[PDB]
Write a protein that binds this DNA or RNA. Sequence first.
RNA 1: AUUGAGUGUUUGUACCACAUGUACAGGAUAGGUAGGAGCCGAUGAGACCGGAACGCUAGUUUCGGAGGAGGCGCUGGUGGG
Lengths: 226, 48, 534
Amino acid sequence: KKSKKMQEALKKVDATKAYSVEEAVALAKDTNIAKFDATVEVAYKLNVDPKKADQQIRGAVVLPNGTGKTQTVLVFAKGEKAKEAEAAGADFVGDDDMVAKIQGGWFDFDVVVATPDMMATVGKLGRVLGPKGLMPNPKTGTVTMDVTKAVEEVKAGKVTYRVDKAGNIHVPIGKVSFDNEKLVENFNTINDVLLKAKPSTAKGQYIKNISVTTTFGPGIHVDQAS
Amino acid sequence: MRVNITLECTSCKERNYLTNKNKRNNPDRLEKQKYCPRERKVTLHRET
Amino acid sequence: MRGQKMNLTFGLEEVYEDAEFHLGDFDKVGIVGVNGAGKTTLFRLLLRELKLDKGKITIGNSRIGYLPQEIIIMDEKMTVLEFLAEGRPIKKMETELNYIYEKLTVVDDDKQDRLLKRMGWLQEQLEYFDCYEAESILLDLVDSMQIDFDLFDQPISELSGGQKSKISFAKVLYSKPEILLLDQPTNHLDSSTKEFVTKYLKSYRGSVLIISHDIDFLNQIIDKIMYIDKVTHKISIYEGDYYTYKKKYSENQLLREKMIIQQEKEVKELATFVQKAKQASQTNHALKRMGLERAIRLDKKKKNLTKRDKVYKRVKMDIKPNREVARTPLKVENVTFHYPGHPILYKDLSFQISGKERFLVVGENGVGKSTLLKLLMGINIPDKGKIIFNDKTDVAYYSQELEQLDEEKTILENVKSDEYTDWKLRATLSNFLFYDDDVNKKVNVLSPGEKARIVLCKVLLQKANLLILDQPTNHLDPETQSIIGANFNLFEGTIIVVSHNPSFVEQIGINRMLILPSGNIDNYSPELLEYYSN
RNA sequence: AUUGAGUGUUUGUACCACAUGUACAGGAUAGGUAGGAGCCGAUGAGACCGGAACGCUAGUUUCGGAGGAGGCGCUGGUGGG
Ligand SMILES: Nc1ncnc2c1ncn2[C@@H]1O[C@H](COP(=O)(O)OP(=O)(O)OP(=O)(O)O)[C@@H](O)[C@H]1O
Ligand SMILES: Nc1ncnc2c1ncn2[C@@H]1O[C@H](COP(=O)(O)OP(=O)(O)OP(=O)(O)O)[C@@H](O)[C@H]1O
Ligand SMILES: [Mg+2]
Ligand SMILES: [Mg+2]
Ligand SMILES: [Zn+2]
């Protein structure tokens, strides 16, 4: 069912033990034996079922230490505001008509933003950015008058989150090479934003499970009260 | 079947009037323009 | 789904009186009741279209898929694809979302907060109803009921009754609902199409309430049966199938009848003694004393004596022709017809009816059955050929979709005829269960079943010798169907009938069947099944 | 309640093992989401042969035999994915 490396990694993990965040992250630094700088994932099994409209959860958080990987920012801007995006460090900024170039080109880029009324034009390309997840959603903070802040935050390592219809939310908190202190700080930031994002109509226990996992290692259950 | 009814004010919902109707001759809810003492104005009143 | 102390009274005729019902989740409930019992009204309460005069009706927050008893065609020019697409709110939200973008450009810093929230919800809502459905619907038609794509671009109003029922059923499924409220989902379907619907409803994991007058169809699906009583204005919920409901119900009414019998005997006994004392000599003091004492018991008895519910009256039909049939009522010779822009339905169609004959126009959905009957009456002019009616033949037409009633006028106004006086009209409407001021009701507020009786009454009042009936038993409660079939059997005239109900055709006793689209004038027999198979 | 042991049968619940995912297009059986350029293998790979299960009849999954070292993915087009 598993290779010896995963079997060996399994021996270092207790299936029935809920680890503290301090222990789990440090253990993750030993269960990331994959032959590359694997990412570290956190999965919360919220009790909310997104089938109900008021139960849906979506947004983004500016991770304090970032994920350690650059994000390519595409900015739809009007007037001199476009130069503001370039000054803020936008990877590439497009006019109203550059959507045609994006259509069939300039793919393999990470995020899109509107400033903010450009959405009247971005709607045409929404069917392309939509299913790919690139559609600028105000709930995620990709649409705003403060494009100068939006651009620089993304370069700082803003990571989006979205509960799937099954009732899970996954987010990359950083690379396995990160110091546990920095890694813990990112993990805690994710915890706070989710609690702040708890829907007002939630009932019962909110976080039914937290699991830490590497790109290749096993999941590690952790205590939300720790 | 003659029955007693109340005519509510369609504006403020005050049950302002006691009257009666024959349900056979007036199946639908009786509607009248009656003075509402709350709003101090003539308003449409409907049986509730 | 739960309802408490339900009350609802349209004018003077009441529907529910202190009615109650509790439906557990994941219950395939079969709703049964005579025409007018209030089965459709229950769904309107669930859909919040209606409000109870008194009481509380409780519904779960889950999304509900509703299949109306009547097709909702907002505009005549609506296409089938437009009709189906309206099942999902994708188009509606996009039109709203497109306007939101317009407002964002116009408004700079005033309404942005409100607009941004509205935009976000629409995107999240749109993704929840994944916009990939455009492709799924196209193939949902194929896998559902073999609905051809040529219909997909055709106006919905031009479809046949059976075809429309397929589209409406598919639309409900297209919406991806959580609770299924099906109001006669197989009203016009043929035998083959009914098979698919049954299998899907058997497999459907969720809760599904079915209003149906088809006992066999329900028995295969129903696990709980809800009976809407027309006389007690109440709701009773049984566990089991239609037969179990009939068995439990028949026993309960039997046990109730016996109770009222014994209470009457005791009242008669006291009454008989009270009278004996009443007529005794005034000099018999003790008997007079005992007579008054029993008069007190007699009074208390008569005040606790349960009233037997008046058994709901069944329809009485006496259809007789004014004149006599000929040996050749109808002559059809070399008749060809095609709807402009569509393939020819039949070529050189030629048949000849014999008189006092049961003529069945067999076929499948969308094969030309209703077109042929419309052809005879004169609604459709034949592209080729001739249709000749003998001067001795009077014709009465029962259309499939109930297109012979004025929704704006009342029941009495619809049946008004130059040949019938007022009391004559009322007497027949009472035979069709329209009593007293029930005939002044607008046709627009009647149920499909009650409207079918008015159409039948129009056919009866003609006293024609040829009956062109297009699915007569549709919308009728099972009891009224058997009455319809039995009375037609005794009709002393020619009957051209179309019916997908196997029971109804057996009662009429068909003589010759005309198969479509392959024109085959054949003697009626269980070989009808052979044609259905082939 | 005093009132405690079991067995068996039928049931409610929760983990735990297993297996299931074929709309049309599309390499063809892509169930959802995230990470993902790497992943697996003489701890005996691909291919081959036989048994078994599923099956929408296309194929998918699993066990064993022989053999001994190689394969899969990224890149590529299709698609809402
Ligand atoms: N006004 C019309 N315009 C264009 N096409 C029509 C029109 N009426 C019917 N058609 C087509 O004629 C075909 C058959 O006509 P018809 O209405 O008689 O079906 P049917 O025999 O009554 O089937 P069923 O009653 O079981 O639904 C249908 O495919 C239908 O699409
Ligand atoms: N606005 C109204 N005004 C007067 N009477 C009404 C009104 N609405 C409904 N009724 C009556 O309510 C009664 C029962 O309602 P409902 O239409 O739901 O019966 P039904 O069981 O669904 O009919 P069917 O089974 O034949 O389809 C009808 O007889 C109808 O005449
Ligand atoms: Mg109804
Ligand atoms: Mg027809
Ligand atoms: Zn008032």
